[PDB]
Structure formats: C-alpha cells, structure tokens
Design a protein around this ligand. Structure first.
Ligand code: NA
Ligand code: NA
Ligand SMILES: [Zn+2]
Ligand SMILES: [Zn+2]
Lengths: 85, 85
C-alpha cells in the first residue's frame, strides 16, 4: 500500500491507548514515539494529511471507529484530501 | 505566543535549507530532527495545523515567503484554520 510507511494503525492504537490512560498531549506523544521506533518516514506529508483528516474527525466529533474506517478508505494522503475528509 | 512550543521558524529554516540542498523527504526529515532536538511538544496538533497550512501553500504554489507570512499572521493552529488557510 502507498501509506504503509506511515505506520498508521500503530498510530491509531497508540492514540487510543494514550487517551484511555487520560494522558496529556497524546497526538504529540504518539507521533514522537512512532518516530523513535520507525524513523522519519512516519513524518512525511502524506502521513500528515491522513493523520490530520482522521484526528480532525475524531476531535470535532466522536465514534473514533467511523473516523478511522472512513479515512482509511477515502484518504490516500493527497493534499487535496483535506477538502473533503 | 501560543505556538512558541512548535519551533516553527526553526522548521521553516530547516525546510528551506533542506530543499536548497535538493534532498529527499525534507518535510519528514526536518520534522524528525526538530523532534530529536526539542521534543514532543513540536508535534502537537496545533503545530500540525500550522505546518499543514504553510506547507500546502508552499506545495500547491510558490513564493514560500508569502506562504510563511500569511500563515504566521492568520493561523493560530485551530483545526478550523484548515478551512481558509
Ligand atoms: Na506528522
Ligand atoms: Na506534525
Ligand atoms: Zn512498530
Ligand atoms: Zn533549536
């Protein structure tokens, strides 16, 4: 897949666990840990686009589950995906 | 300032230098280096919003200088800033 380098399921599971523990700065801290484990490829801009689409949806609303499933099906990390995700 | 933790001028100067050297994956590699130097606070979502606004503008067009000046004046890192930046 074109986004395999982004480790996005790993990011998802990190954010869910971090929020379950009620920790501060989960987006930042998960991003950082995944960088430490899997390197700079997880911070490319296409990864950023997917994450922003997913996290805006998960911030501005609820059901993390539809936020993930919808982003995963319709977002390829193109900058244009922000217009609809 | 509310975005001082994001080290965004540092990011800007990194991206400009990296692109001047014609290197691969400058967005990713600058993000990663700034994380290594200044920690997880540089990866908060408000930082992500500012960077995405700036970099989309700098990708979809040119004059990096107006992309920076406009984002810096009108983007506070609110998720809603994506609608207009
Ligand atoms: Na990112
Ligand atoms: Na980021
Ligand atoms: Zn892993
Ligand atoms: Zn520094």
């Amino acid at each position: 897949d074109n986004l395999t380098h982004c480790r996005l399921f790993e990011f998802r599971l990190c954010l869910l666990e971090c929020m379950s523990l009620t920790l501060d700065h989960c987006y930042a801290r998960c991003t950082t840990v995944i960088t430490q484990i899997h390197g700079s490829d997880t911070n490319r801009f296409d990864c950023t686009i997917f994450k922003t689409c997913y996290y805006r949806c998960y911030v501005l609303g609820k059901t993390e589950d539809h936020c993930w499933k919808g982003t995963a099906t319709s977002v390829t990390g193109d900058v244009g995906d922000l217009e609809f995700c």
